Design an enzyme around this catalytic site. Sequence first.
Site, PDB file in Angstrom:
ATOM      1  N   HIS A 214       0.804  -1.215   0.000  1.00 21.61           N
ATOM      2  CA  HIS A 214       0.000   0.000   0.000  1.00 21.61           C
ATOM      3  C   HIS A 214       0.844   1.276   0.000  1.00 21.61           C
ATOM      4  O   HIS A 214       0.304   2.355  -0.191  1.00 21.61           O
ATOM      5  CB  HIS A 214      -1.108  -0.030   1.057  1.00 21.61           C
ATOM      6  CG  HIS A 214      -0.710   0.137   2.484  1.00 21.61           C
ATOM      7  ND1 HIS A 214      -0.192   1.302   3.001  1.00 21.61           N
ATOM      8  CD2 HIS A 214      -0.840  -0.710   3.518  1.00 21.61           C
ATOM      9  CE1 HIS A 214      -0.019   1.147   4.312  1.00 21.61           C
ATOM     10  NE2 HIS A 214      -0.419  -0.068   4.649  1.00 21.61           N
TER      11      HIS A 214
ATOM     12  N   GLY B 119       1.846   6.206  10.539  1.00 21.59           N
ATOM     13  CA  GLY B 119       3.262   6.102  10.204  1.00 21.59           C
ATOM     14  C   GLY B 119       3.908   4.784  10.627  1.00 21.59           C
ATOM     15  O   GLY B 119       5.084   4.568  10.344  1.00 21.59           O
TER      16      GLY B 119
ATOM     17  N   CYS C 210       3.078   1.681   9.700  1.00 20.44           N
ATOM     18  CA  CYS C 210       2.998   0.568   8.772  1.00 20.44           C
ATOM     19  C   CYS C 210       4.395   0.090   8.401  1.00 20.44           C
ATOM     20  O   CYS C 210       5.326   0.893   8.251  1.00 20.44           O
ATOM     21  CB  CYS C 210       2.202   0.927   7.532  1.00 20.44           C
ATOM     22  SG  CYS C 210       0.492   1.415   7.858  1.00 20.44           S
TER      23      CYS C 210
HETATM   24  C1  LIG Z   1      -2.522   7.065   1.816  1.00 19.79           C
HETATM   25  C2  LIG Z   1      -3.122   5.705   1.638  1.00 19.79           C
HETATM   26  N1  LIG Z   1      -2.803   4.856   2.783  1.00 19.79           N
HETATM   27  C3  LIG Z   1      -3.540   4.812   3.897  1.00 19.79           C
HETATM   28  O1  LIG Z   1      -4.635   5.354   4.033  1.00 19.79           O
HETATM   29  C4  LIG Z   1      -2.898   4.089   5.073  1.00 19.79           C
HETATM   30  C5  LIG Z   1      -2.413   5.142   6.055  1.00 19.79           C
HETATM   31  C6  LIG Z   1      -1.372   4.686   7.062  1.00 19.79           C
HETATM   32  N2  LIG Z   1      -1.950   4.038   8.246  1.00 19.79           N
HETATM   33  C7  LIG Z   1      -1.188   4.036   9.349  1.00 19.79           C
HETATM   34  O2  LIG Z   1      -0.063   4.490   9.355  1.00 19.79           O
HETATM   35  C8  LIG Z   1      -1.702   3.525  10.656  1.00 19.79           C
HETATM   36  C9  LIG Z   1      -1.272   2.300  11.151  1.00 19.79           C
HETATM   37  N3  LIG Z   1      -1.676   1.782  12.320  1.00 19.79           N
HETATM   38  C10 LIG Z   1      -2.530   2.507  13.042  1.00 19.79           C
HETATM   39  C11 LIG Z   1      -2.998   3.723  12.641  1.00 19.79           C
HETATM   40 CL1  LIG Z   1      -4.112   4.613  13.631  1.00 19.79          CL
HETATM   41  C12 LIG Z   1      -2.590   4.258  11.435  1.00 19.79           C
HETATM   42  C13 LIG Z   1      -3.265   3.395   8.156  1.00 19.79           C
HETATM   43  C14 LIG Z   1      -3.329   2.478   6.954  1.00 19.79           C
HETATM   44  N4  LIG Z   1      -3.826   3.137   5.701  1.00 19.79           N
HETATM   45  C15 LIG Z   1      -4.360   2.132   4.712  1.00 19.79           C
HETATM   46  C16 LIG Z   1      -5.594   1.397   5.166  1.00 19.79           C
HETATM   47  C17 LIG Z   1      -6.414   1.988   6.131  1.00 19.79           C
HETATM   48  C18 LIG Z   1      -7.558   1.359   6.589  1.00 19.79           C
HETATM   49  C19 LIG Z   1      -7.890   0.125   6.074  1.00 19.79           C
HETATM   50 BR1  LIG Z   1      -9.465  -0.745   6.705  1.00 19.79          BR
HETATM   51  C20 LIG Z   1      -7.102  -0.493   5.115  1.00 19.79           C
HETATM   52  C21 LIG Z   1      -5.943   0.140   4.651  1.00 19.79           C
HETATM   53  C22 LIG Z   1      -5.091  -0.545   3.610  1.00 19.79           C
HETATM   54  C23 LIG Z   1      -4.090  -1.474   4.226  1.00 19.79           C
END
Ligand SMILES: CCNC(=O)[C@H]1CCN(C(=O)c2cncc(Cl)c2)CCN1Cc1ccc(Br)cc1CC
Lengths: 305, 306
Positions: free
Chosen positions: B41, B143, B145
Site C-alpha cells: 500500500h 506512520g 505501517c
Molecule cells: C494514503 C493511503 N494509505 C492509507 O490510508 C494508510 C495510512 C497509514 N496508516 C497508518 O499508518 C496507521 C497504522 N496503524 C494505526 C494507525 Cl491509527 C494508522 C493506516 C493504513 N492506511 C491504509 C488502510 C487503512 C484502513 C484500512 Br481498513 C485499510 C488500509 C489498507 C491497508
Amino acid sequence: SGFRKMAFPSGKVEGCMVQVTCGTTTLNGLWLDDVVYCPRHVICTSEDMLNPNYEDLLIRKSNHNFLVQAGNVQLRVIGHSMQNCVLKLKVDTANPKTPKYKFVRIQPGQTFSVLACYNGSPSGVYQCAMRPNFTIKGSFLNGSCGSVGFNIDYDCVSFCYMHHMELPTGVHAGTDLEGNFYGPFVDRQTAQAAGTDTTITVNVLAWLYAAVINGDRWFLNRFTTTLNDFNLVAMKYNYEPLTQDHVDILGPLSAQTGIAVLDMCASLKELLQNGMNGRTILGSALLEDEFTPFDVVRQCSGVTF
Amino acid sequence: SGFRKMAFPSGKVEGCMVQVTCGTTTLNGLWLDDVVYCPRHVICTSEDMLNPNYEDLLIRKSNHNFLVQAGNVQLRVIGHSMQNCVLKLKVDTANPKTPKYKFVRIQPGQTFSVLACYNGSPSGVYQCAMRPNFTIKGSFLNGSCGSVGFNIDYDCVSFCYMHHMELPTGVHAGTDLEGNFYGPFVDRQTAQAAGTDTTITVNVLAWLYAAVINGDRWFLNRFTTTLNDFNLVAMKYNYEPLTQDHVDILGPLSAQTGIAVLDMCASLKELLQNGMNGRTILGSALLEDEFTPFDVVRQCSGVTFQ
Ligand SMILES: CCNC(=O)[C@H]1CCN(C(=O)c2cncc(Cl)c2)CCN1Cc1ccc(Br)cc1CC
Ligand SMILES: CCNC(=O)[C@H]1CCN(C(=O)c2cncc(Cl)c2)CCN1Cc1ccc(Br)cc1CC
Ligand SMILES: [Cl-]
C-alpha cells in the site's frame, strides 16, 4: 491507537553486555568505554556472602581472576577497583559500540526498561517502575545479576539500575551505576525485607488520561475536588501523596482531554471507594501505576530513538 | 521470581529498519540482505486506497520512484516485485547488520515481540498475541505501517508479522513476511470487521501453571473434569476450545507442578464461576491469555516454589 506496556528499543544496551566470571561465579557486566561494571558480590563465595569484607576479599584477586567475554571475544582486564557496591574492571579495549550515555539515579515512581541477561547474553526486555519502597517488581532468575535498567532520550542512554538480588517476597533490589543501593538494602545474605509498598498516584492519573485518549471514558464524572481533600483519600487507600508538581506535570494531558487533574482525581476517588463495578480500563481490572506522564505522552505521540 | 510481559531484545531488528517513500507516502521497511520488504500500500495515494489495482499502480513506477533511507544513507533501488500484499525492493547494498533470520507464519494464540517504528526509527518494543480472530491488540499510530513482529528463540530472528492497518474497532491487522494477511482482511479501505474475539484457553492454563511455579496455589480445587465437559463450560464464557494437542503441550508444565492438566481445567472452571474474590494472580485481577506454554517455560524457573 492502542496502549501497551512498552519498553525502549534495547539495541544500544545489548552491544554493551558482557559475561564476567570470577572463580565459580558467572554473571553480567556493562561495558562502556574501557570499563566493565558489575556487582561487587561477584567476588564472594557462598560463605563470604553471609558477611563479606569486600576490600579483604578483593586484595586476594588479580586482574587475571576476572574473565570477561564480549560474545565470543575475550577482553583483557588491566585493573580492578570498587565504587560503593559496584566493581569496575578496567579493560584494554574501549567498547566500539559504546552509545552516548549518562548514569542517572532515579526517584520512586519513575519507570525504566530492563534488559534481562544471562551469561552475558541478553534474554528479554520489559518495563519496570521504581516502587515507593525502592524495590522493583522484575522478572529475574539465577544468573541475572548485573542486568541493567535504562531510559533513552534521542540518542542518549541513561543507565539507572543494576540488578543485585531478589528479596524473600520475590521482588528485586539493586543499585545505580555508581553502586548506591536503591532502598534500605545491603549486599549481604542476611534477613532483609521490602517495606510495605504504596501505589504511585501520579502514574495512575497518567494512565487514566491514556485511557481517555484511547476512548475509555466510563469512569469520568461531573465532579472535582481539591488537592487537600484528595490527599486525605489517597492516604486512606495507601496511595502516595499528589503534589502540586504532579498536577503541573499532568497539565498537557488535562488540556488535551478537557479533564482537569482534580476532576480526574474525583474519578479516581470514586474508583477507590466503589471499584470498577465489573468494568475494565485499558484491559485492566486494576488501577495501573507503572506508566509515567512522560510515558503516556511518548507512546501516544510516536516518539522515536 | 516475577512474571512480566517479556519481549525479545530488539537490537537485531532495529538494525534492519529503514524508511521507504513512494510519492507522498512514507512508511517503514525491513532490510534483510539486499531486499527491502514493506506493505504494498506504499504505492497508494488516498485517492487509490478504496479500490486499488495494485498491478496497474505498480507498472507505472520505476525503480527510482522508490526512495529507501537507512539512517542518513540513501539506498539505490535496482529492482522491485510484489508478492501477495508485500512489496520487495531490491537494493544495491546488502545490509551489513542482517541477523540470522527466517520467515514464519504463526497460528492464533502464538505470541511475538513488536518493534513499533516511525520513519524507519524504532519507538518501542512490546509483546502481542495473534488473537483467535486474526487481529492483534497493539499500539500503533499513523506512520507505523511496515513495523514488524518477531521471536528470537536461539539466536535466529523469526519474522512473523508486518503491520498494514488499524481496523475500525482499534485492533491491528497485517501479513506474514510473504505478504499473506492473517485473517480475512484485505489491503483496501473497504468496510471490514474482525470477528468476535475469544479467550485463548491454552494460554490461560499456561499462566495458571506459571502462578503455581512461582509459589501460588490458592485457586486450585479438589475436583477434575473431562475435556468435553470443560469445553462445554468454557465456551459459555467465550473461551476457545481446548484440544488434545493443547493438553499434550501443557504436559511439561503439568509435570513440573504435579497438577494434571484436567485438574488445572477444573481450577479454571471455578475461577470463571467465582472470580478472584479480591485476590490477584501474578499481579493481575483478570485471567491473562497472552502467555503461551513456551513463553512460561522461557521465563519461569525450572524449579517450582513448593
Ligand atoms: C494514503 C493511503 N494509505 C492509507 O490510508 C494508510 C495510512 C497509514 N496508516 C497508518 O499508518 C496507521 C497504522 N496503524 C494505526 C494507525 Cl491509527 C494508522 C493506516 C493504513 N492506511 C491504509 C488502510 C487503512 C484502513 C484500512 Br481498513 C485499510 C488500509 C489498507 C491497508
Ligand atoms: C555466591 C554468592 N552470591 C550469591 O549468593 C548471589 C547469587 C546470585 N543471585 C541471582 O543470580 C539471582 C538474581 N535475581 C533473582 C534470583 Cl531468583 C537469583 C542471587 C544473589 N546472590 C547474592 C545475595 C543473595 C541474597 C541477598 Br538478601 C543478598 C545478596 C547480595 C546482593
Ligand atoms: Cl464538584
